[PDB]
C-alpha cells in the first residue's frame, strides 16, 4: 500500500505539471495573437493613408 | 639522384609558387622542347598562358595552344586528352586518325 | 599530508569568513545583524585595509578573474619538467615568465598572428644575433627553404597591383607605354617570381656544378639520400603523395 | 471615373482589413479569458481528492 | 599614372626594372634592397584604410608562414623532433597558421598555451615527464580545472555559496522533508493545503 | 529553518505573493516580531542564526555550498535575505504589467521598499591602487607561503605582532563583489530610470 | 518627468504609505515602537 | 505631393514590419526559454517517486 | 561645438579645425587622434 500511494502521488503531480505546460502554451499563443492584432492595426493606418 | 632532385625541385617550386598543375608543366615543357628542361622560353610560355587565361577566361589548354605551342595529344591520359576534347567527343562514325 | 590539506582547507575557510564579514555590499539593514569579531580586528591590523579592499567583478585584481586563474595555473605548471630538459617552460617560452598582469594587458585586442610573429622573430634574432631588417635582407636571397626567397616589398607591390586592377587591362589600353614594359615585368607582377626565384628557376643544371648547386638549393642536412623517399618529398613540400 | 473606382477599391480593402481586425481581436480576447481563468474548481477538486 | 592613382616617376621606375636579371636582355635593372623598399613605400602610399588593413593581414600571414618554414629548416633545438607546422604549434604553445581575422588578448593566449602544455604533460605524450609532480592536488581535479569557467564556479563557491545555494533541493535531505516537498508541489497552494 | 524556507520558495514559484510573505515572516521579518503584545528584542526569528552556531567541521571535503554555509551560518543569513528581496522585485514585475496609473504607483512603492531595505551600493576601490606584479613574482612560492603562514598564525593564534606586513609584498589578489548583488542593483537602477 | 499625471489624493496616499513603511522597518530612528504595534499595522500586509 | 505620400506609405510599411519583427522575436525568446528549462523539478520528482 | 553641430563632425575634428593642433596624447588607453590619422595601421614600420 506504500507503493500504491506513491504511484498516486506521482500521477497527480504529473497531471498538475501537464496542466502547467498547457498553461504556458495558452499564454504564448495568446501573446502571438496579440502581436498579430497590433501588427494588423498598423497595417490599417498604412492602408488608410 | 642529385640531378633529378634539382630538376624536380625547380619544377615543384615553380608550380607551387605559380598555381600550375603537374600535367600543365608537363605539357608546357614538352611543347617548349622534348628535353624537359627550363630556360627563358619556358617561363615565357608560362607567363603568357596565365595572362591570357586571366584576361580571356580560358583554361590552361586554350592558353597553351594560343601561345604558339601545339594541341596536346597526350594529356594526363587518365581522362580524355586535349586533342580528343577537340575532335573526339564523339568520333564522327569511326575512330580518329 | 593530511594535516597539510586540512590546514589549507581551514585557511580557506577563515579567509572566506573574514571576507564575508567586512563586505560593504551588506549595508543594508542586514548590517544591524552582523558583528565585529576580535579575529576581525586581528586581520585588520595584520593586513591593513586589504580586508576593506574589494573590487568590481570584471577587474584584473579579482581572485576569480582570469589573471589570478593564470597565476595559479603557472604556479602549478612551473615544475612539470626538470629545468635542464628541453620541455621546461622557462626554456621554451622564456618571455612568458615576465608577463605583467595589468588591466591593459587583458583588455587590449591584438591578432594572434602579431604575437606569434614577434615571438618567432625574437627566437630567430636571438640565434643569428642581427635585427629584423637584416633578417628580411637574408630572406630576400635565402634559397634553402620551401618559401624562401621572400621579397616582402615585391609581394606587397604585387598584392597592391592586384588590388587596383588585375590583369592590368587598363594598362593594356595604353600601348605606347607598353613600348617600355616587356613581358618580364608583367610576369613578375602577375605571378609569384621574385628576382631570386627567377635566378633559381633559370640556372642551368649540370654535374660539373651539381653538388655546388645542391648546396645552394638546400640545407646541409638535406642530401639525395634524403630526397629519394616519396614520403620525404611529400613532407618536405607539404604535398600529397598522389600529387607527387 | 476610373480613379473614382480605384478609390472605391481601396475603401473596400479598408473595410476588409477592418473586419479582419475584429476577428483577430475576438480570437485574442477569447484566448485571454481562457488563459487568465487558468485552472477552475473542478481540477482543484480532482487534485485535492 | 592616374589609373594607379600614383606618380609618373614611380611607374617609370617600375617599367624601368628590366626583369632579365643579368642578361638575356639589355641588363639587370634590379633595384637594391633599400631602393626596393622605398619604391614599395611610395607605391603603396596612395592606399585607403580598409585596403591598408587587408594588406597588413596578407603580409602578416605570408611572413608567418615564411618564418615557420625558416625556423623548421634552420634551428632544431634538441629534445624535440619538430618536423612540421603543428610541431612548432605544440612546442611554442601558440598557433602559427590561424587566420588574422581572429583576435584575442595577451591573457587569453597565455591561458590557452598553458592549458595545452598541461594537457600534453598529463597524457604522457611528452617524454621525460616529471611524473612525481603530475600527481599534485591541482591535477587530480583537472577535469573541473581545465576550464576557466568551471574553476571560477568552484572557487566562487566557498567564498560566495549564496549564488549557488538552492533551498529547493539539497543533498543530505531526509525523505520525510522530501515527502513534505512533494506534498506541497501542487499547481495552486492555498492556505489550508500548506497547513 | 528549512521547512519555512521550503514553503516560501514553493509559494514564490507559483506566483503567489502575500501568503508567501506571511510565511517567510516566520523566520525573518525586517519589521521585527510581535510577541506578547510587544516588540521583540531579537532581530532574526531563528535562534541558531542569532547565536551564529556551526554544525559542520570539515565542509570542504565535498563540493557542496550546503557544507560551506552550514559551517558558517551567517551565509544562510544573507541567503534568506536575498530570497526575500527577490519576491519584492517579483512584485514590481506583476505590478507593472497592467500599465495602470495606480498600479504604477504601487510598483514605485515596491521598488522604493527594496531600495530602502537594500541600502547603499559600494563601489570599486582597490583596482586603482593595486600595483601590477610580473607573473613570476605573482606566482612566487615564498609570498604564497608567507601569506598562508600568516593566515594559520591568525587562525590558531591571533598574535598582534607584525603590525605592518610590508605591503611591498604585493602579490595577492583582492576579494570580488558578489555578482548577484550588483545584478539587482543595476536592475533597480534601470527600472527606476525607466519609471521616472 | 511631467509626463506623469496624478491628483492630490493619489500623491498623498503615496507619501503617507511611504512614511508608514519607513517607520515600520526601523529604518527611521527613534520610532515610537509602542504605537507601531497597533491593530491597523498588524494587517499592514493587506492594508498597504 | 503624391510622391511624398508614397514615401509616407513605405515608411508606414517598414514600421509594420518592425512591429511584426518584435512579435516574432517575443515568440522566439519565450520558446527559447521554454526549451532550455526542459524538465523542471516537478517532473523529476514524479519520476523519482 | 558649433562646427560639430553644423558640419556633423566629432569633437576632435572641430578641435583641429579651430586652430588648435592635432592632439598627440588623448586618453591613451585608446588610439589618439594623431595615431588615428597616421597610424591605422602604420605603413610598414613604426611612425616617426
Author numbering:
A (entry chain D): 2198 to 2246
B (entry chain B): 441 to 537
C (entry chain B): 50 to 293
D (entry chain D), H (entry chain C): 2100 to 2148
E (entry chain B): 880 to 1074
F (entry chain B): 1807 to 2002
G (entry chain C): 978 to 1025
I (entry chain C): 490 to 537
Article sentences:
ABC toxin complexes (Tcs) are a class of α-pore forming toxins (αPFTs) that consist of three subunits capable of assembling into a single protein apparatus with the ability to shuttle and translocate toxic peptides into target cells. The two TcAs termed Xn-XptA1 and Xn-XptA2 are the targeting components of each complex and display variations in insect specificity. The TcAs are the largest subunits of the complex and contain a translocation channel with hydrophobic loops at the end allowing for membrane permeation. Upon TcA binding and an environmental pH change, the complex undergoes a conformational change into an active state in which the translocation channel is exposed and pierces the target cell membrane.
We separated particle subsets based on structural variations in 2D and 3D classifications indicative of RBD A mobility and observed the State 2 intermediate in the Xn-XptA2 wt data. We were able to resolve the Xn-XptA2 wt State 2 structure to 3.9 Å resolution, leading us to conclude that the State 2 structure is a physiological intermediate state preceding the pore state conformational change in Xn-XptA2 wt. Upon closer inspection of the region around RBD A in both Xn-XptA2 State 2 structures, we observed an opening in the outer shell of the protein where RBD A pivots outward. The narrowest area of this pore in the Xn-XptA2 wt State 2 structure has a maximum radius of 4.28 Å that is surrounded by four amino acids from two separate protomers: D518 (Chain A), Q152 (Chain E), D156 (Chain E), and S291 (Chain A). Comparatively, in the Xn-XptA2 YWKT structure, the narrowest constriction point in the pore has a maximum radius of 4.6 Å and is also compressed by four amino acids from two separate protomers: D518 (Chain A), Q152 (Chain E), Q294 (Chain A), and K291 (Chain A). This pore leads into the inner cavity space between the outer shell and the outside of the α-pore forming domains that make up the translocation channel. The NDs are located at the tip of the TcA and based on our current understanding of membrane perforation of TcAs, would most likely encounter cell surface receptors or the membrane of the target cell. This makes it reasonable to conclude that once Xn-XptA2 contacts cell surface receptors or the cell membrane, this mechanical stress stimulates Xn-XptA2 to undergo a conformational change from the canonical pre-pore state or State 1 to the newly discovered alternative State 2. From this, we propose that once Xn-XptA2 encounters a target receptor, the protein undergoes a conformational change from State 1 to State 2 to allow an influx of solvent, presumably in the insect midgut at very basic pH levels, into the inner cavity to further stimulate an additional conformational change leading into the pore state transition.
